[PDB]
Design a protein around this ligand. Structure first.
Ligand code: CU
Ligand code: CU
Lengths: 130, 130
């Protein structure tokens, strides 16, 4: 609801914030759109995060995370197509690998991790145990 | 877009229709909401299917399938929560197991398969290869 802007501040009992957000050198590069959830009949509960992986083309490649009381769900968007992804350390490392490698003196490496993540994207399958 | 109603008719080059829809004894029990996709700048392309697994409580437990030119995506909804699921024969059998076991002389068996599918639901994880 109310959407703050900076994490370099108050603490949060959310993993996306401790595991990924807080370790991004330049959080602003990525247009962090971050609403906080509560005031709806409830009162201070979840966090709703959106990062642009390609801030040159809004919404071309985005990362969203919805965190609540108990659960968290993760999503990736590439070219209009959304896919949920398991929130884990594998995804986190891939996320920071991309987020923390921007550096104009090494575009090649950064773009390398970006293309690696799209690869991951097309890989996601949603499965159950039968 | 234009939403037909009956499959006991024309043929379709879509798996949801050949593998699941066409094998449901009483397709109407489940409020098949089925739009056909095309006329949008395109022209005859996809099929958009929605089945109510609990037709007593609209949208409490639903199954949706979006089929297009090449791909198909599958979704399950239980109590407001949506989760994509891999479209395969495992899901199909689970689907018909539920859809084809309605029978007032054996509510117990039917309800048995319904509860088994909710179980499956909470099991779905979305994973990539790293
Ligand atoms: Cu970049
Ligand atoms: Cu039933």
């Amino acid at each position: 609801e109310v959407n703050p802007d900076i994490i370099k501040d108050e603490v949060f009992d959310f993993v996306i914030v401790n595991r990924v957000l807080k370790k991004i050198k330049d959080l602003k590069h990525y247009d962090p759109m971050i609403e906080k959830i509560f005031d709806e009949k409830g009162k201070e509960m979840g966090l709703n995060v959106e990062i642009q992986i390609n801030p040159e083309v809004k919404d071309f490649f985005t990362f969203k995370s919805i965190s609540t009381t108990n659960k968290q769900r993760c999503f990736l968007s590439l070219r209009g197509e959304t896919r949920e992804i398991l929130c884990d350390n594998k995804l986190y490392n891939m996320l920071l690998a991309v987020f923390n490698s921007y550096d104009p003196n090494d575009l090649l490496k950064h773009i390398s991790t970006v293309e690696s993540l799209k690869k991951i994207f097309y890989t996601i399958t949603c499965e159950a145990v039968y």
